[model samples]
Target: APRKSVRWCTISPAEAAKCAKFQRNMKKVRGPSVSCIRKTSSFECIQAIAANKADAVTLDGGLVYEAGLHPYKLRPVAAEVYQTRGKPQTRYYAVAVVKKGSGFQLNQLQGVKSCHTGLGRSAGWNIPIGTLRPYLNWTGPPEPLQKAVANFFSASCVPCADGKQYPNLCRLCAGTEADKCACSSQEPYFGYSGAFKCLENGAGDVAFVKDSTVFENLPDEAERDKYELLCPDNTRKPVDAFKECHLARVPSHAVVARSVDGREDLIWKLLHRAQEEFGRNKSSAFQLFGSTPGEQDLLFKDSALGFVRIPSQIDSGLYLGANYLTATQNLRETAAEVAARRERVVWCAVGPEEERKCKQWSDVSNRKVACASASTTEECIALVLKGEADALNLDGGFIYVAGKCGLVPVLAENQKSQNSNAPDCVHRPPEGYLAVAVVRKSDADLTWNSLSGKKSCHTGVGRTAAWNIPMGLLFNQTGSCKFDKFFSQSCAPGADPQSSLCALCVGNNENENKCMPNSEERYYGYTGAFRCLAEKAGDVAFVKDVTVLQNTDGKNSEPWAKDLKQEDFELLCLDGTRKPVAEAESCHLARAPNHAVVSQSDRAQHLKKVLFLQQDQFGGNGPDCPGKFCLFKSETKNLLFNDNTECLAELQGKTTYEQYLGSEYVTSITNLRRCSSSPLLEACAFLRA
Candidate 1:
């Protein structure tokens, strides 16, 4: 007979605890006919459901039901609704809020700057957008917001809702999120480093984010007086922190199937089996099955298990008092291994109707701990991870773990597998579902470094002075392959100087095209590479990777930075006197077939398009002429400024000259005279006060 079983498909520890008692009373019988599966949320799981790769999804009750996740065929499995008297189940409104005294009303936020995930993310981005879009009256399909924000915001919507999550949420909460991607997410660009360095060696009106505190507690800054919450509170105020956010009484989360089809019976059977096994009230023969053990411990000999962070709270019981002797003697070899390793605090959890699964782990494993609270799926996982517990056990993957942590699968358990004798708490990617990182469609075109640079404007200095660097440099490595190293060389910070070579940075071409050539739009001011996160609205553009090398014995630095241009090396030493660096040399793909040499005319145009201009190919102080300066006016031609303060002074009256200094003059210079005659400039005295 197809019986009813309940599984904690996607839930947290607290939620699991709530279901614990329920699981206890229902599992009065025992048989092979019922079981439950517990899993942690993985990026792949979210993607599967959102991309239609999976037919079902299950998550926190708060988000799932409100998000409107019905069963695969739109049939209601169970939508346990909670009514708060005055609060109706429908139209639970969460307004976009700001600080009370900030003077940033919802109406005033129109066209204001915003931020979100880069793109392709479902939980942190799509789910939130889906919740708000209908209310905002947005007609366009949910995709990237970068290109769409302009069109999306143009409609009656105010402040754009930002349509993203996390760091972006952090930004809005801090009130420093910027609109411009180049200068500050707030300020305009000045001129300085490499060729595109901003003026005055600084950044612009920027914002910073803090993970530990509430918005009300942050030390206020005047420049960032206006802050808007991505998800508002009851009073229509911006939420103080991530925890303060909640969707209407919809399913807090879900595990939607791939489609509405013939799998209904199997789905229901699985659900019922899980319910019965987890001790949820169900139409099953194993009515009192879960009451057998006081402290059942499942052993995890598999190091591949990734949930060493979720804690378990199932350690005591009447079953332990009644059946301790029978279960204590049946302990297996895996039990010994777990006992030896469980003290580091294994985190575990279960959600609604999930207590049976927790108890199964307790009873079968011979260990004595299970998560105690199972009110909300999110809370269940939170209890484990937030507690820094080891080994989270559940039926489905927890996307938040994927969103925040880098999880490596360690163990596999199957409670029903006779050959394996393992419990069903192990999580595996279902079919096409595997770990993934998603971003808003808007931020799909920008790079992590570039985005940081824009946000960096707030910290170092003003927008015109500092190159935009994101706050805390929180990079999005969700999708892009991080070449932590290249061709055996390090490019980040503290790498062995000897390995910082181009040949090493170029990486192995034998299997993969590790490096990509720049596009033909080379000198075009608006080619995709240089486009801002702002240009894409809020998308992540390209990737800027670094490489590093092995240690320099005891003397070498830790990480290395490997972004070197061939031209930079060309200017390192004079012609023909090529000196090999004790460290490695930097090269480019610009030399051969990868890219054709632009015609002189195109080259000329290219020079004009580069942000900062310098006559010397290498803009900074050259190895040949230390202390000599090279600068450019606009991107057109290099100008010599040795003791040329008078010359710059002389131009103050010229209208044509003012055009050259368009808000970014300080960072826009590389003297040509340094390349031709450094000694002459030194004699002329180019250093300014």
Candidate 2:
């Protein structure tokens, strides 16, 4: 059996009244029938739909997320498309618009009069209030965040907000007396067009609306020329530049339906038929995208062009996207919690050993630095994405993954300069790392150029010091993708578990972590790769020169390494010759970019500040002195940071992984990634969606 008509949920009486005409108009055409259901608010509609009393309701993107959450699990079944040649866009840009010569930037918005589409809606109140929160100085919890915002701006037209609590919030509305700040279309200043009209009429200093609002309302290019978009970087740009300058990009509003059996087909069929007959400017007796004369934006956005079915897989979280979802959730957080999260840097550590050092550093850094430990570096990056952790120093290869997932590099790990006379290590540029091929002196036949069918060990499958650099160079030389066939049997943790590449991988003593990409694998990092060689499990190990030098000569007193000697190993030069480990400067596959700290874009600036402060108190030339506590002085080869690290040098213009790693290496990494995909990388992408 199939339902013949959809019970459309309407919030306001105006919407209900419009739905009555819409129902009659549809009946005459013998199209998909419509029956109107009244509700006081979106919450009631969601509850009614979940309880099977109602069928569908169109919601703002932000509200869609709330309805998508527990109890009432609704999914976005249809998107309200806006702008373009039938492209049916599912996203929009939230921007702050003001007069072109307003003499203001984003940073100086305190006490400015504002106009919002509606309270708690996307683009208008949600993004605008969240962006200015740090400047509000409001104590969170027990006290409502709304009052401080009401007091922060001199006056605001935020429809749906309580006018009794803060009269200024209703001060700029075009509605007179009883109609002021009304949540429905009857209030003249209530949606994108309504808010922009407030700006156009000089009633408000700034209007928080989407990218298309100005164009949809103003009509002419010259009339639009009088306004500019306020950007996050304390500057302003022309309205056309919204893609580059806006508060946050968010998903378009969607018609939500029950997750179970909720008449999805009926709703889509109903919406599809309605759009065909009464779509924007259709000249039909009823309009789907217009509430003009009565109110602006009744059930859908006045700026919306038409309705298109959303993907079946897209829940509100996916529809909202990673950046916008986090932004919306952040606004829901108490200001105290937000302040606490912003106060210190939560450093993500990869292993137990790294976690220990991080804890000590946390102690020494006046608790300005905190610790969040994960089994693998990739997991740590994932933690940052989940907002469970703040920052972590990543190898160049992992930095590429982090960058792809929208993380930014904060600082580089500066290493010791060759000049012994140099005292200012903190100020020195990074020396970087040399990805060298290492072999026992006994393997006299092995050289970088003659490593065909050789048993090998790598720091990790995708790490710079081990796999990417050496394998990338070899791939360029051999012109092949089957690195597995090149190396008969090797321990490259993170490779296919069934492949010969992971055959030599020895897990922890319990043998449970074989082929893992983290500390769990016995043959994991520089230290683990070197251990693979010392244990005679592999003929060659691709690691940095320091790995060879540090493990030998009693530098590392760990049992297997205790008897190892500096003279026992040799480096495989790019040429067909072998050289002493000390000659790494001239004999190496490539010089890899130094490890650098990374975090979510929102935390980039704060993370940089915390790390700079930590290094000043713990750097090589710190005032606290080397005898007390130092970040560079690791008991292990490299835990949390390289043992040879001098300081975390500021990134000068190399603001991205592409710029930091350079184009050549980035391209090499990109090509190497073609051979296999990282599960961790895919996991992040999935969670973000």
Candidate 3:
């Protein structure tokens, strides 16, 4: 009996078990030459896709796209990705651990000792950041958050490969003086028993750690405490181990196939069959990876593949997988299908943002028609509408906005029609097209539960929660409480004031005038105060190429969020340990909040009443962008740095760095010399340079 051809591959942490079972299954099926190799780094499987060596390879599904692997190639083939979670396993979680009675607040990350062992490590940093930060908002250059980050300390290090340094990789945040690590060989002179140890002795208030073992090792009271882990279905070992993490991205995996030849139907069928077969027992693949029958269900339930799971990124690419034999054989068996092609339709991107699409088209050996004159979405759509560009590739968020505005949506990025007759207009979202929300670790439980009742940060249709922390598993574990139930209800397109999908809270009007000062958009109050509380408790903020918060007051009406801030507004800045953020315009104040709120509406008078309460609240430390002039100080810095694609911009042609430092001195002598405004801005405002 010949086994199934080399159609797909399953990479797992339990490679030996998966390999042994793969060989056994292949021997039974008389499968094609089968091979499975094990390596310490799971990243090898992802890098293989770029090398084009794998029809499919397995890696941590949560990080597949972020790890720089094409999501289309690395679909989920097994019940669970790998059989374990620990060091050398590569899939861990971000947990929010706080002292017993701390009144958790967002943006209050002021003085907490954070126990994140793999600081700067993607697993330890990216997921936690994604967990704590907005889902789709990583456009800014990675800034070193001094106050929150000063709490992180590297536990231990081992020379793994040559001079390469590998810390113990504590999935558990512990201390330097723990019993297990004390006086052991692996524990050098600096070893300890506990997992999370604050590098600085006078550590701040609490800890938001990323270690399950630390939670397990703490005393029953310390361990018995309630905290949450944010993760997704694809990577749930640690979360499931502690019953903490959740499946952030609900549809854990997706499979995509491309065929110049027309066997999309055949490919879809075979791939779907495998998806069904795997979905039927899910444990079948788990068996392939050698999980005990009982543990298989515990490790993976939501992750099983089904017909529903295999949705096309759009539709045309839906039926494909990494089956070389199937694809090559189909091309030969049905040569007529290839020759029946009428028009060789290739995509050309006209807008600046569509550059990636054109580059990808070139990679596929397709011709691209470039229109340097075109710049926005409308220009790109015009090229396709006028038949100048055969096809157009746009992201999901852009498509939604384009449909609302007047551009004809020919097809989705995957080449499927939107089936919409919506008229074209100049509609665009208030913030970036893609939006995600980040919360503080303290509000984990409240934030997770709050999402159930809050309005979506994204008001558009089709925009559902894409990624979340492992702790989101609680929703799945409860069965009926699917995230779709909560998300679909809150963000439905035809939502009503009385719809179960939404909580028509009263506070919507309270923050409308002041919360987002830059834009006219009214604030959608949190049905559950937890999300806001989590964000307010932690330094909850958005960092897109343009600031998410726009200033809508009479003074600065620019579309960018950062532009909304006036030169003299007070705000928090993320800089130096325990250093306060001072106000530039009113030097009477020691330091301003590192960030600012766009001045909004009529209620601004009332907000002025409570301003006294928040004035001196941030004394120990504040949020600040390193070395960049405050956008609020002058329209000059905003114009120079706001619209550009990156968050941190360079100020060059100056003699010394100090000349371009804070906005204090510049705003001090403003009206007399006009030094506050720049060469380009002063001309716009009719002021002499």
Candidate 4:
């Protein structure tokens, strides 16, 4: 009842010739007989398969999605699987490869000579262009997108582009006059291997392709070592390290067949037998995954280790996944829409406490300001990377984390000067607060030079003014990472409750909210740390200089601070000296950078403009201020921005993350980060991938 032989589809004459040889080998070996069906392109092959002219063909995931749509209605019957470092995977990385000594990063690709596999392909075009959309100035359709790409890069070989319309786009393509920028593998520089050849031949500086292109082309270990992968973090790594250092991991290309009463079982059985006999390292007579010397992936992906049967119920969307599908669709949208997205500044807020404040700020700005919420600050940073949110204010310690994730700071919080007007506080440089160690004057025996056996109180573990500055100084002096050993006991929220460091913390007195990192704890912030010292629970409190003044001298009516006088407490200076609470301007531990607003660089200017306008209306001196909506003041706790903020300061030219936080501060934070390990930090990196 069934045909004796299966008809395989081929896109070009070269591919057809290879398939002819494969068919001959299949028949001679007594396997299922096979025949070749020639076609002009991958699109034509899809049409042939849908019409039953050809039984099957392998396709890029982009084309597989197209084949599954409307008229054709094809489905994936088998998926190509790859092996990275001997472990089989259903996905492969889209990477940007450059010569080892190129000395350029992913972000510095502008105005360079570039190469691509072909037009509308996944690794060759979509991923690279989408990742660099903010830097590409081309907008909307009707105007050729290739022309804009040409304008961005000095030159590029994007096959299928009209050379007359986008001459620069075809300038580096290694094809002759009429055949320049051919859409298929016939062109000299068209597919993954072709694009790499374009770079290898000195026609382009960077080649956008999959991870295996270098190994396939170079082969020799010494030659392969001459190439490197450009990472998103502006660093380069050896070729084999692509699993950890890559642009993006994409779904593998698949084999597509008819969906209605399809020969799915027959095709899988045929593919399984063919791969077992002819797949990588298993084949010598008729290679199923290897290409000819000049041809790119004739029948299947060259790097694919084997094939996996696709379940009958698995649709194209499920196979591609939501993120990859959305990314592919976004690459086809008008460049204008992409550029406009870059202009909108969407702020990220963590938790309901910040969500309420962020939503309020959005409403007060007439919805010009938008907000996206996440469960943690690390998640918010990942949102920025994925283009979901534009900005958020981060503590100085978190600034280092965001910087490593490729985000930059926009504006910094400037607390008001003690002598300035309450309603007219002005902006100040980021070197704002003086971190201080406070103790009762009666504890005159204590000094900054010696306090190994004393109990300590901190705002939080990773906080800048509280933990990072004081603990960092202590770690530097002792050359030890065991802070629990450095202090006799401590109350650093977000630490292990079972550990002695969390012994003094007074949580919400509930089941699981105890010893939380946020305001849920009764002793959690600048004022709380002072209270810890005032109650005699801890011998010393590490906090900002303003903590003592804000709670003492009858300023705070709370039971702990109601009778406390400023003269009763003093600051422990770093020079083994003590100073009155009022004289913290000169004697303190370290001057910490201000909390700053961070966002993607493309939206930084727009965010700065909108923030400055919003601050003018709801800031401390605004017309409806003091009770209605004071942006600088908060009651529940610090919200999206700091409660003590005077105003959002002008960024001027210091817009990058490193520029906002001075080099000295960044260096100190880097030194401090080496002494610690954070599960949350690792979670952020996982979220990033």
Candidate 5:
């Protein structure tokens, strides 16, 4: 069977004519057959391609994303490649240009006259505006973006803005009244060249355009030297140095096709054949890289050297890259959309107990927060992966899990010193607490060196300071996954129930099935494990340094805690000795890493801001101390964050989970997991997304 000729969509008649010429020349040389289909706009072309009326279209990175979205699921089949300084590249820089003596930094652009190439073009509209989003007062959605720009800048030339509603936005445009703000070059200030001219003629203080604009228009070194670029760091650099001073580097335009029932392979074949015959330096009746006079990059970028076939599996995000995708999404976002993102941080609260406490925190923040609950930490991690929740604090063991699931740490819990009235340790890392193996003083003869048949109480399976540290040390000694056998009887919640690990667990109401990794399990956490030891059900308890003091010494009044004295507990030293409970600093296990809030990479900055603000109002030493709620005081025992947390430690420059967790700690965690694999390890597959 013979394949039908491919139909390519174009935004204008001129583009269609050029495409038609290429089609004729292509057939003359016996290349793949192609036909041209004209449309009024890029969006129209997008619809045509999705509706199967057109087989394909060349589109900017921004439009590629729009076309790839729901109801129009399209994929890039090929990318246009341009020559930059004799090297073929598929990317360009978006830059903001101003006169050298303008005395304005990038951050001080508010209320200034501006010039933009067009409303939704990549270098012109998306990159620059997205870079300055924090400074803009525009609430996303219902509010007209043009009106927001008009209100922000005293006057500006956004060539596609509606003149009646955003008169000031179109005021600085060089086009005569009626022609102002047109989408194409018909408006004098509507493209890279035109926008640069708007600034050259003193019509605008700044011009949002591609990096090549000044080089193309001025040509003369002295004239080009008169201009400078506005960098995101609030610094300025010479115009020609835009490679180092760009607002953002964006991906090149790509040819897109419908995800389903589209002739992607045929289109790629035709494009490859056309470019090989009519591309730069090729001999053909039609030039694919040539533009008609007064038309910029018609059909294809005039300077494009050729085309490169994209992999069939490459989706819009991978084709456009992360930075370009974010810019495009930001540009297309409505005011209401922006407003919703800014409204509150939707926190992932694991368990009903944590959810209740999270709501209180939300109230304490005056509705600056919301909650999404999951039955377990793994479920919470999945919620974050699915984008259903923003963030949650995870213990060191679960931190590794979250990291594996692609969540990055935002802030760490800094514990307060019980010995001092010193300044709050908000930003600084506190001397970490000790992890100890606590035993009743009555077991005076027992030592860490010999505990072959001892019953053990563990915080929970896969938890640091409780299971990983102790079980890891034992596994290193024996080189086997027999900690369950070593202990004889144990209560490591979340472990296989049929295994001896669940033998000693006194679950809530004596229902052993309640032995899960959460608050529902009666003997599952630090305090729970300590309670196990205090009740004499286990020979030893693996927990943090404060466990004994927090439960005994008049701190806890529960049946298992009351009447218990700190002096009644002793720590087993790995050096074949025992010491007083208070001496855990010198006789304990490894110093466990602190717990930290983990969130998706894209939402890290916003979540950090919200957390910092909430801490200011309800922190342990805040001015409103002991108000309706205290952030550092947990009502349900370390639900979302630790109850003893003094404040969140400063991140410095560490942003990613790997960076924050540190290599040495990560190695230790990996080694520990190998000794006994986490039961929830399967959830890491979601991170593959």
Candidate 6:
């Protein structure tokens, strides 16, 4: 309420001098007013912000985690995006690097020599030691985690970690005199490249560093092979396989503010304007990302490109992600909280009914599983990306979007087996679902060819069976983008509410949330589209073949579908024949990959183990089925998953979304999306940064 000048917090005299210049430049530039506040340390700066004496301060991922803890509840307002790569990124991966033929496993780090980038650095100190917390026998408090780390290795070079208290921590230092094991570059093993040199020179057996460290040091691909990565599961892999086997991916530094009154609006306003005029190459006299020569990083890292305002929903813990957050937690861990945070499956639920069903699943799992809801499937995907939720089953159409956004497929939804002698559902191979066009048997004259200008019922816009696969075929035929004109009327949820594409969409029975893209839309998903055809709302329904079978012939007990029969619906084939719904094998538009569960890489392993355990209990054939709630069944809503799902089958090595969806389907979806991209997909594009 006061005419607040955003008081910038600085930890040193040199930094305070830079902040004073920043205050002037921002004033002349007519941006948000600024004032400089000097604090002795980052920890002191955090306390100053909590006391309202300072408004904001730039902090590393480790300190940001500390700031977000109790009493001071500081949250990150913006991330400092770096331009070291082709595209600016807000994160980097932590990895365990070992020289070839070392023969020591990740689980056996008890007596091996160790080298670290620096004290409290993400890749070096935080991730490695935090991940090793379970093995350390030291109790909390009186004995510090640093003491345990020093004794864990026979000899080590962790620059900046107290050498006086634990001499062994700095035993591997090579620098002579007082400079030995110093925090600065004067020390031989002080940072990422420095630690790699320690491992290269044979004093250290293992090096904890960033994924980019090895590639940057050993330019030749062959030379790079001299080293391999230590995986979390006590195995090793090639250097290029770090994505599949890293310690953690840590977030970039951020400008932090008090959780109660962060003054985010002014901070955001001042940053973008400052970056436009002075960030990176637009380097004005008073640079935001620059410092005096030899002074190194002052107010912010010199490598930063600009500042990006983080979403309001992202607290420091979410911004740093699960691994890095737990790394900090493991030190102060005073495990019921940390264990629950890591082990629980926060399934992202789409829409009201699906969310309700997920709540039931959560309670039945004794809270091992939890529910996080969004009104649209894309919103659900966004929630998972933000770390607000852990996993969700997605259509292959969305799998493409999630893949591009850095999410991986953990498992596939195996459907009812068609083979007479095939293995059980959980053990069977996925044959892919069939996409078919359905029409009322009464519309005997309509065929796939002559069905122009007829009303259509689509599952939803940008959906697999309804939009992507159908449009992939139709776009090739029509050679145009006027999909709205292709049909006289259609119920394509997620289209403009006033457009012909949304005409047939009747929302809830109460007439709300029209043209919505989730379960609430009434004409939204597989079963809903089939229901539209049964009610004569459209001439044809574009849906998977299983939808027809699942909702017809006494399968559904809903009032609208009570009298529905398989014979009541007919399929529109390219051969100009209208055939029975059972004949979809020969009359379908295309065979599409089945839906699957997806999540970010950090959550993938834990989510996979939890989901597998859950399916063993509540899956289709689980012993608890019909007693506890089933994960694959939710009446005719198709709420959380298709009712026919037998199990959440393994992905083999097809962990990435690109691998699970296959090449042709990904290419087809890419081409179709070019004609018309989903707004939600575009909204997620920046988040990939």
Top-scoring candidate (TM-score): 2
Tens digits of lDDT, candidate 4, 603-627: 5688888787777778767666665
Candidate 6 residue pairs in clash (backbone atoms < 3 Å): none
**What is the number of backbone collisions in each predicted candidate, taken in the order shown?**
193, 0, 81, 1, 8, 0
Per-residue C-alpha lDDT of model 3 across residues 1-689, encoded as one tens digit per residue: 32333333333344334345544554453323434444333344444443444333332223333333244334332212212243222133344434434554323433334443233322233334344443222223333222123233222221011111222323122223431221111222111111133322223232334334343334465344443232333221322344444312111223322212222344344334443443345445423322332112111222232323232222211111111112222212333432322123334443222344344334332222222224433344333333334334333223322222223222111111125312111121111222224333233332333445433332222221111111123233343433334443232221244444322222223433222111112222111121222223212221111122233123334332223222322222222111111222221112111111111122123222332222112111112322222211223222111222112111233212123212442232232122212222222122100
Model 6 quality (TM-score)? 0.70
lDDT to native, each model: 0.24, 0.79, 0.28, 0.76, 0.74, 0.79
Query: Per-residue CA lDDT of candidate 6, range 1-689, in tens?
Result: 43568888886566788779988887776767878997665667789989988877787677788788889888989988875554678887778998998898788888988899777776688888887767877766457777889888887898777888887888888867977776544566766677887798888989998767777568777778998888897899887777688888888778998787678787777777888876777755677877765344667765577888877766666577654554576576644566677778899888878888889988899888889898778778766766768889888888889888788888888887656633365656677888888888787878777878788888988878688877777887788888888888889998888888888888888988888988777888888887787777777889888787876878888878777889888877876776788777888887888888888887788888888888888776678978977778888677778887777887766776667778878877888878786654664554455
Off by over 4 Å in 3: 1-4, 7-13, 26-34, 59-62, 66-124, 130-689
TM-score for every candidate vs. truth? Answer: 0.22, 0.72, 0.31, 0.58, 0.56, 0.70
Candidate 1 or 5, higher TM-score? 5
Candidate 4 TM-score, C-alpha based: 0.58
Models sorted by lDDT, best on top:
2, 6, 4, 5, 3, 1
Error of 2 at 422 (Å): 5.7
Task: List the candidates ranked by TM-score, beginning with the highest.
Answer: 2, 6, 4, 5, 3, 1
* Highest lDDT scorer: 2
Q: Which scores better on TM-score, 2 or 6? A: 2
lDDT per residue, candidate 2, 1-689, as tens digits?
A: 55777888887788888788889888878878878988766656778888887878888877788888889989989878777433557678889999989888887898788889888787787888888877887765467767888889888888888888778888888787687777666678787888888888888989999877787767777777988889998999988787679988787788999887888888998889788887777756887777755566778877577877775655666566656766676666776676676678888998776788789887787788888998767777766776768878888888999988778888888877666625565556676788887888897987666788788888887888888888788778878888877878888887788887877887878888778777667788888888887978788888888887777887788888877888788888876888888777888777888998888887778778877877777767878847678777766657777777777877767888799888988987888878776665554454344
Stretches of candidate 1 off by over 4 Å are: 3-8, 11-43, 46-76, 87-91, 110-143, 146-689
Q: What is the lDDT, from 0 to 100, of the residue 124 in candidate 4? A: 84
Root-mean-square deviation of candidate 2: 6.8
- The number of clashing residue pairs in model 2 is 0
